[PDB]
Subunit: 362 residues, 5 copies
Amino acid sequence: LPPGRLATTEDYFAQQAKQAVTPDVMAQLAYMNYIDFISPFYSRGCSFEAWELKHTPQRVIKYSIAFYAYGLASVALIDPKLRALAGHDLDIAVSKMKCKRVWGDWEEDGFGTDPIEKENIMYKGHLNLMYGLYQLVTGSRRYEAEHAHLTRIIHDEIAANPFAGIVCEPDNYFVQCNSVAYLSLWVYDRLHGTDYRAATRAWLDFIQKDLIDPERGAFYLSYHPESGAVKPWISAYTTAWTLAMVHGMDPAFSERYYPRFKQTFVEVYDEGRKARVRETAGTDDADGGVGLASAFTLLLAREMGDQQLFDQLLNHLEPPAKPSIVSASLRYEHPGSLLFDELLFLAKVHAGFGALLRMPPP
Amino acid sequence: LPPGRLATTEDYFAQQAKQAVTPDVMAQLAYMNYIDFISPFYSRGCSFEAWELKHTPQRVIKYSIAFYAYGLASVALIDPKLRALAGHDLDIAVSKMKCKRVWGDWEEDGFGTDPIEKENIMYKGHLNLMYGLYQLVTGSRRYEAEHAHLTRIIHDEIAANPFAGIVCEPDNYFVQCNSVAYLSLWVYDRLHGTDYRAATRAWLDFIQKDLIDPERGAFYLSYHPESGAVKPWISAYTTAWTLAMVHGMDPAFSERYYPRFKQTFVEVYDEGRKARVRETAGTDDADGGVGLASAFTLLLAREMGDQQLFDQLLNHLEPPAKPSIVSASLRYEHPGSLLFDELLFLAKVHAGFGALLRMPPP
Amino acid sequence: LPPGRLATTEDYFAQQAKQAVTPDVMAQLAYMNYIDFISPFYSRGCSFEAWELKHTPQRVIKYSIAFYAYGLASVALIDPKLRALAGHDLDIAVSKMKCKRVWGDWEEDGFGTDPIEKENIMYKGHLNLMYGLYQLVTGSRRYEAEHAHLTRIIHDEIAANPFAGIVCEPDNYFVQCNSVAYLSLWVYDRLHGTDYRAATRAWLDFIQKDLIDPERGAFYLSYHPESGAVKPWISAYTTAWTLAMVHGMDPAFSERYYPRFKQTFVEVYDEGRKARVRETAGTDDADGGVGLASAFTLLLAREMGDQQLFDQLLNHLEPPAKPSIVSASLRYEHPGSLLFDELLFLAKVHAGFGALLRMPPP
Amino acid sequence: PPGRLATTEDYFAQQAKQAVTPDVMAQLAYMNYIDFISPFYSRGCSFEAWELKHTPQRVIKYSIAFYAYGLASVALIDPKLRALAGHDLDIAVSKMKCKRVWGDWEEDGFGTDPIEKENIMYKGHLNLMYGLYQLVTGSRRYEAEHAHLTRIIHDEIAANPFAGIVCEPDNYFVQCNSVAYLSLWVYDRLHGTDYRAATRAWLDFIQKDLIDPERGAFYLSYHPESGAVKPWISAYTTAWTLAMVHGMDPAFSERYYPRFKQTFVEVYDEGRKARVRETAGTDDADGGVGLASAFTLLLAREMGDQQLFDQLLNHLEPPAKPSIVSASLRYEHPGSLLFDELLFLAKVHAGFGALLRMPPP
Amino acid sequence: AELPPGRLATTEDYFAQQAKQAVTPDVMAQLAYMNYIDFISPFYSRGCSFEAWELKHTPQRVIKYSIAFYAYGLASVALIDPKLRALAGHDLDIAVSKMKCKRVWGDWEEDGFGTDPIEKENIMYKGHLNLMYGLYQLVTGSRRYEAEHAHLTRIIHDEIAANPFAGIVCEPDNYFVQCNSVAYLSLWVYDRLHGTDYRAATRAWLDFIQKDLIDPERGAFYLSYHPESGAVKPWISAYTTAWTLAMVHGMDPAFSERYYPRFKQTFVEVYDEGRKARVRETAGTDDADGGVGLASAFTLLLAREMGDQQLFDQLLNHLEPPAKPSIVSASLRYEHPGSLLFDELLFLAKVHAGFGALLRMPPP
Ligand SMILES: C=CC(=C)CCCC(C)C
């Protein structure tokens, strides 16, 4: 057990075989569920006290809820005795995700009154994937009508666009936001026997043209269809997130680029015991930009089964954040980034996006 | 009298036989009633200055008023010369309980504009019990119409549900919130000769299935009917509160579990002179979560007639809170939790929920 | 003479015979009248800058204006050359008293949109007495219509109630608030030759039943007609205020209780040179509760002609408040209570409520 | 002297030299130079300059008026600055009409129209400013408004049993009336009318219960409903009133000026400095509103008393720590409200009589 | 040659960017500040979000100038590096969208001047908007804003034709030469795109501003003109002059060439043995960068426009080092920006190709 760590990499990777979460993951689920009013998964209502207490910026709440939801789906697969709890939490995740506090930036920015009708794939990609994971975990048809409606909007918008995929803000295309939307089509197809996922091949061909640097195994920050502009910086957090989700749909795609991604961005230090991730090229600084390169690489390492890099990144991320378990509930005194407990939770439990797609019924 | 204690456990337990409150309980009633504008029981108006001055969070004000009300009902039973004052204070408790500042979280959370119509048993359970205790103490029919209306809503909601009882927020079931609602039906029946309390047996059978760990004498945190999920943590404050109220309706039920509850949660320390209560299993930490395990166990100890545990808990709770009596009014310099003066007041005077049910008329 | 005092007790009691206020009272009138915009008696407008600068709580502004008004009425009787100024200041006192900033707490508490129509005798008792004193001082009929309307409301409400008098907040009866309303009926009768004051005898009989402890010469805090409750604490500030005003209507009543009041509450200390007043029984602490026991006893001492107690209380109250006269205007650096300059001003000039009733015309 | 920017001789010579002192030019730079935040940047209802100096809302109307009276003297001092002074007066009038400036009248509950009746504090200044604008520029931009407000003031004087007009209802101030009467003299100069004929009855009225003739000092205020005169004399009230009256009846101010100085003015530091007591029965300087010394500085200028001017400016300016940065004047520690406004005005003031006789452009 | 201390690149490097068809690494790091981080970078989205400006504490009234100066810099980036032209175009698209948000123009309404910021006057706002419409279309060839561009160009032309003085006021009765210079340049850009002759109005404007608005001996414009009163504020302004001469150089090079040497004599202080320069804002002071505090920053732009490498080097040696630039994760930040519009004006001066060269920008 390296210093400041709560459990071994071996323990996190063995959770599924043992059909039990580690005590520190159970303590994270207690933070998420235990205390009246202030725990994030206390109620379906439009209360965001848990996010106010952690100082989550408004624009990031949608990602907070989504990453918690993706983690809860893996908890359901790990421990059958926690599947009902995971289902309950996903029900709350979907309700909170639909509150105006979460999507309202779309209206305040002047882009429209309806966050699903067009564009805004950042928000509605996550919502659509969450509808699907909720139904895979619980077998409940509570959101089926909404799920079918949003899936058809995403399919129709892909069919209408001359580029493969959907924009976020108008004229802003991000590969990582698209990767969530495409994965949501795979989940819908698993539930209903449809073929919405057939659009995936053209998308994977499109993002391998001007959106990737194939030598570095790295995606450019964004694409802008009106001007044809690709922003000339590569992004580690963008790439780590995209390759993790793509691995669930086309494993060979992520396997091809993963080693080049690591060469481009990953700095091993402290005699092989630790790693930290550079956000872009032409710098020695770790975790610049949004500051999430290391945390998303931790998720990618888990998705790809790379125990060594997982261990190195968690040795960098967790100890300085000063975890403590008080009354069987996990707190970090010094979270090192946005989405800190969310992304460490997700990476600790993640079963692979492929395994979530094949989740047995309840 | 140990240092920082204001009176002996023997003195608190003798109050009913002597037909007099201890001087420190009288000084608590002075805090509650004495100073113009800022005392909590100054006026019927929707002024919450007393709660603003002690920094009571909005969501907790409803519990503050309720616990004061339950204490005042016991004062009425202890000293006939204080019964009119207790009645006046209960009148104010009911008026304040109906102010939007108290119930308004129900609307802000997006659950509805009417706090009584459906669900919300946390709020309307306390309100219904308060209507009843007011009428037991005073004989006044001021709230009788409202009391009948809310009692019929609670009866109809119980009859309609496939599980025994009523949810708080939608799909959130709490045993402690239900225990208040069921006790309110016993009080209505005492006033009117009805049999709304007949629903209690099915409820006591239901909460002894998946909602209790019978070996540990401990209720799980909550139940979620849509998913069938029971949150997998046991809760001391939940159990202490529920067993205290159930003792008034089915004494044998609470007698069965009380010894197991104490084994599971109660830590005796300082050579038997003190006790503190763990909030959940798998921790040594006292008073985690909402931080009320010890304070609600103090009430349960009083309800069960356990003088030794009462003395031990009050020796833990009161001295560090630094009580002082200035101008015959009680203040705590360092309240150790939410609802601190409310729950110590209640535990000091509590005559048993059974004895409140049999309160002689005015 | 004594250290930190501005003038001798002999000087304050001689003001009427010399037909001149002391220099320190003139300096108080300068604080009240001198500086543009920020002096309290600058204009009729709904500007409360003077009260914002002293941090007067909203609920206390009505008492601030009233006590200033009662002092100004005595200034009119002391110095005929200041009677026109006193009249001008009383005109402003009445205008400001009618501003929503002053009465608005009645609406915000949820008791109604009209502060005069019913109850609220705290506010409308003072207003009615102020209408009367304004007309006694000036001979002006400016407010005569309003005065007749409010006097008739007070008379009708007394006639309708089964207890003698009127409540403040609904179901809250205070003897001190009633004493102001009854005195306002004596002033109306002195202006118009009516007999509204005939209701006084039944009131004086009523407050000598459960509302007084006749052995201790002390009124209980309050009465609550719905429940029949009398709060079981005696109050010095309540008693001092009530006996001062009653002395103007039934001198024998206040003469009977005054010596017992002093025995119950007044602590003489520092070898007979100083006095301070306990607010309630069963304490050694001075000036608890609202903190006005000593200041209202100073007024009562003046009303009863007790120079020794006046001198003792002013030796306690004034020196620690650190009076300073700058540019012929009085300021206190450390006022010891609410209504500090108001009540010291009033006690220094007070000619007796009886003498204000027989105030000869201009 | 140390902390002074220029000699008393220099300020009093400005008109003869047809040039403002460099420090007065630096004050005009503070007033005019920086985009958005200078007080005379635009006609708009922007009050950034006043927010930055923490001017209380109720004082902004006096700030604008005193700047305007100074700008009228700048126009008389330097013909090359007359167009600038005219532009600044145009802005002064526009800003004076913004609700931020007059709005206290409505918020206090006295009415929605600040001109219709009473409120002579506000509308006296506005009327004098309309007149000075037209004397400086020859522009008829505000002529209609000027005629309307002049007729309101004349009609209200004619209707009142006391000589003049109240501020807040039942509050009569001699200093506020003195501005209104002077505005009638300016209207008469522009149009050949005789609105100023009302002045004699006013000067007779204020010499009854409103003045202590032995001390040369006005009482604080008069209250017609009650007949009350507040029993304190006021230096700032007297200094302001005598300065403005000197422009209409020089003999009146000449009669009282020496008694005023005996009553209120303390010479100290071996004759080099002076400070002014606000009322009688105190040794404290600059109590009450804290403007006794600043208004006495203006009165000293109006009466041609160079010695007292020098003494007061030696008291007022050095502790305020003037600095000129990039040819613009700032005070680090202004000692009162209206500080840069009243020092500006006193430094340039040509006399209210000379403003009345301003030659056309 | 040598890199002076605290500077990021040599004057020679900035002036060679066009010939090398590449921006310096520090200009690329400025474009990364402008474009890189989600939500908080100024050119993240078309939306009415101003987080980037809230984080730098930009006063509301200055946001319109911030966007405009970024836009003028981006136009030169498009001319420097063809591989960045599409990015420059995308950023200009966002600049135009943000420029139309009420947060940017709203001061016009709050000041009480009207509910429509374009209909009349307000030439400081609508001059920049009109020039930005034109630069967007020169860079991208996109007709997205063409209708709006034609509408605003005709408003500006009609208002010039209607006024007895040459040009348009900002606030009513406030005339500024620098604000007019932007509007006139916007007519030259429209003419380049459409073959029209709206720019013919320029000659009468250049004749007008050489009467009472300039001190021809000192090569310096007066602060402002006020048509109602005929008043010219009697102070000369360096930032006013530097800005006006830079833009006029694109329309009448001989005009700016005539006054530039006199401007430098009047305002520019060379110090530290010829290595540094700082600019006095007005006459009759030794203090540098008084008033709005932008004399030196606008003189840096003018030096670039006039091809004066020596003065450019001296001013940048004064401005940049004390601001403490650092490049973190390939993005430029200043720890102590010395003025308003600091990163905007240094960015612009570093890339500026000349307003004449932007007018002749080849198509994509
Ligand atoms: C009613 C208005 C006045 C008394 C004007 C004088 C006020 C000042 C200069 C603070």
